[PDB]
Structure 1
Amino acid sequence: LQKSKKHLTDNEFKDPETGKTCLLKAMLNLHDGQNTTIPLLLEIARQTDSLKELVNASYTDSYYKGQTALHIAIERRNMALVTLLVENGADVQAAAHGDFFKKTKGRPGFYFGELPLSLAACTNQLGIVKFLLQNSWQ
């Protein structure tokens, strides 16, 4: 890809009608606190520009809408991972109001508050919520 322009190239490669970029999918299919691609894809994104579109890439459908990579970071317990995302220009004011994050017993979604600060709070992640408020620039 570094031989190519990468701009539309990877924006077309993400899964149709779901907005699943390489970083989001890397965190759902990780294991025991690592995938070995999540640093790597961010290494690709700091040499090849447009990292800010990658970390802040959220789903497109109205059923997973707004769930950035950071929501998956908090939830899956890897407190060291979420350090890298906020460092690497990831959004923390991301609003995930799809339909899995509303109040409906059809498709029984889990409502956490539509802010990653509230996901950690509702998840028994107190060391992480403390980190969300003393984290670097953002």
Structure 2
Amino acid sequence: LQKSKKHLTDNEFKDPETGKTCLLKAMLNLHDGQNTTIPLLLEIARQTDSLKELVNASYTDSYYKGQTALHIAIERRNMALVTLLVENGADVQAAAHGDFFKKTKGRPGFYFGELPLSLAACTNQLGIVKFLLQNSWQ
């Protein structure tokens, strides 16, 4: 990806029908709380330009609309990955709009309030609450 751009090519390597860039895919398939590609995939994005569009990225589908990779780390109870991503941007105000994330609907879903701070409060992650309010960056 060095030899073309990494920017659109990662955007073209977003999983179609879901919008998953490689970042969101990583925390989904974790092993003992770490993939060991997550540090690397951040290394590809920090050297080569446009780091924001990997972490600010989210699902594109209407059913997980707005679920950034930051939401994933909060559900999987990984204090570290919440730290790692918020260092590299990873907006703490990303609205997980998707129908999975809306009011009860009479269908399968978990409503927490669409925002990562509300996810942590509704997940029994008090450490992640206090972190997201006084971390260092955002």
What TM-score comes out, normalization by structure 2 length? 0.96
Note the alpha carbon deviations across 1:44-69, whole angstroms, 9 max, x for none. Answer: 10001111000010111110000000
Kindly indicate whether the alpha-carbon contact (under 8 Å) linking 1:55 and 1:90 is maintained by their aligned counterparts in 2.
Answer: yes
Note the alpha carbon deviations across 1:2-35, whole angstroms, 9 max, x for none. Answer: 1221222111111112110000000101111100
Give every structure 1 segment of 4 or more consecutive aligned residues whose post-TM-superposition deviation is greater than 2 Å: 103-107
Q: Give ranges in structure 1 of 5+ residues lacking alignment.
A: none
**Equivalent residue runs for 1:1-138 within 5 Å:** 1-138=1-138
Give the share of equivalent positions with the same residue, in percent: 100
Deviation at 1:88, TM superposition (A): 0.4
Note the alpha carbon deviations across 1:88-138, whole angstroms, 9 max, x for none. Answer: 011101001110011244431100011100000000000110111111221
Kindly indicate whether the alpha-carbon contact (under 8 Å) linking 1:92 and 1:115 is maintained by their aligned counterparts in 2.
Answer: yes
Note the alpha carbon deviations across 1:70-97, whole angstroms, 9 max, x for none. Answer: 0001110110111011110111010011
Q: Give ranges in structure 2 of 5+ residues lacking alignment.
A: none
Q: What count of residue pairs does the alignment treat as equivalent?
A: 138
What TM-score comes out, normalization by structure 1 length? 0.96
Secondary structure at 1:100's aligned position in 2? helix
Kindly indicate whether the alpha-carbon contact (under 8 Å) linking 2:104 and 2:110 is maintained by their aligned counterparts in 1.
Answer: no
Secondary structure at 2:100's aligned position in 1? coil
